[PDB]
């Protein structure tokens, strides 16, 4: 038992982080096979990156992998990422995919500085397409990922911090999550919302681990639930959400809609000085898949 914000083991990704330097900018890159992926704003000097990149040669890119120089033999821009072809394939390349995740989906972040991993933590893509990360200067190029058996699905590369202290970035093909652009012009996160299906998953986690105090005898319709959720800035729950909570419903014996009735009363009454899974807030950064993986024992390799 117990329930923790749990990241995937990070070794498969650690073996891919490298330092990319060019001009006076140094950031992190991701070395898979003979390609190094990094944020395009590594490019020298409202920038027009196509124009800035045609002025570069391969030898203006310094790629450090450990104590080993990698030689750049080709480059191209794909959306907001640079792809640097190097003359050596990464022998530690795991099996991998690039995936663009939906809001509400979680992933592990390996924070990196100068190509050296610093820590790993678990995150969610917020409904407003920011992530509440932990990032300092030089963390650009750090990636977020999930692991399925032996395969690393990369889903995030870090680019920028916004004025509110939250973070914005791209999928590994360089497309920003959300409306953000990689310029130093005023931008701000839209209004965020709480990820309802995830809160419900976490309440099921609480029950699996022995916490029941918040349950009730009431029930609710999907429509009536959504009416109360909107009022508390929760995302509407949809039937596919209900279907995804199916397995957790059947393992606990608590119908999804009955669990919606306790969330409703938790929203209306607060938590009255009690805690759930060591939290005094309703947690929304565990997906239904996260709960099942941690409460059943699924491994990866």
Which region, judged by CB under 8 A, interacts with a copy of itself, from 78-86, 232-240, 245-253, 274-282?
Answer: 274-282
Which of 19, 128, 170, 294 touches a copy of itself by CB under 8 A?
294
Q: For residues 74 and 91, is the Cβ–Cβ distance under 8 A? A: no
* Cβ 184 to ligand 9HA shortest distance, Å: 4
- Residues lying near ligand 9HA in the complex (CB under 6 A) are found at 27, 41, 135-140, 159-163, 167, 182-187
Sequence positions preceding breaks in the chain, C–N over 2.5 Å:
45
Give the Cα separation of 283 and 195 in Å (integer): 9
Catalytic residue among 16, 140, 155, 260: 140
Cα 35 off chain centre by:
23
List the single partner that 110 binds among ligand 9HA, a copy of itself, none, CB under 5 to 8 Å by kind.
a copy of itself
Q: For residues 175 and 158, is the Cβ–Cβ distance under 8 A? A: no
Which of 134, 187, 219, 251 touches a copy of itself by CB under 8 A?
134
Give the Cα separation of 209 and 219 in Å (integer): 22
List the single partner that 61 binds among ligand 9HA, a copy of itself, none, CB under 5 to 8 Å by kind.
none
Whether residue 38 lies in the annotated active site: no
Give the Cα separation of 184 and 189 in Å (integer): 14
* Cβ 172 to a copy of itself shortest distance, Å: 19
Residues 103-132 interacting with a copy of itself (rule: CB under 8 A): 110-114, 116-121, 123, 132
Phi-psi region of 34 (alpha: psi -120 to 50; beta: other; left: phi over 0): alpha
Nearest to 140 by CA among 12, 32, 26: 26
Three-class DSSP category at 63? strand
* Cβ 147 to a copy of itself shortest distance, Å: 10
Residues that bind a copy of itself (CB under 8 A): 1-12, 14-15, 110-114, 116-121, 123, 132-138, 161, 165-167, 209-210, 275, 278-281, 293-301
Which residue numbers are catalytic? 41, 140
């Amino acid at each position: 038992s117990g329930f923790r914000k749990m990241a995937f083991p990070s070794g498969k990704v650690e073996g891919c982080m490298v330092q990319v330097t060019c001009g006076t900018t140094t950031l992190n890159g991701l070395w898979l096979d003979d390609v190094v992926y990094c944020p395009r704003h590594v490019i020298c000097t409202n920038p027009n990156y196509e124009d800035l990149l045609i002025r570069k040669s391969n030898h203006n890119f310094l790629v450090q992998a450990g104590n080993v120089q990698l030689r750049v033999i080709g480059h191209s821009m794909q959306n907001c990422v640079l792809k640097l072809k190097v003359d050596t394939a990464n022998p530690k390349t795991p099996k991998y995919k690039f995936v663009r995740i939906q809001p509400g989906q979680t992933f592990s972040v390996l924070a990196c500085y100068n190509g050296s991993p610093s820590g790993v933590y678990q995150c969610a893509m917020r409904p407003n397409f920011t992530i509440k990360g932990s990032f300092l200067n030089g963390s650009c190029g750090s990636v977020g990922f999930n692991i399925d058996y032996d395969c690393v699905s990369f889903c995030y590369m870090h680019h920028m911090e916004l004025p509110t202290g939250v973070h914005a970035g791209t999928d590994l093909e360089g497309n920003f999550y959300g409306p953000f652009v990689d310029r130093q012009t005023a931008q701000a996160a839209g209004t965020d919302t709480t990820i309802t299906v995830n809160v419900l998953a976490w309440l099921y986690a609480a029950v699996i681990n022995g916490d029941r105090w918040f349950l009730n005898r009431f029930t609710t319709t999907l429509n009536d639930f959504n009416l109360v959720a909107m009022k508390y800035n929760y995302e509407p729950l949809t039937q596919d959400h209900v279907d995804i909570l199916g397995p957790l419903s059947a393992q606990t014996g608590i119908a999804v809609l009955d669990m919606c009735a306790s969330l409703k009363e938790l929203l209306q009454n607060g938590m009255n000085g009690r805690t759930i899974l060591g939290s005094a807030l309703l947690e929304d950064e565990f997906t239904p898949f996260d709960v099942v993986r941690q409460c059943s024992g699924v491994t990866f390799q």
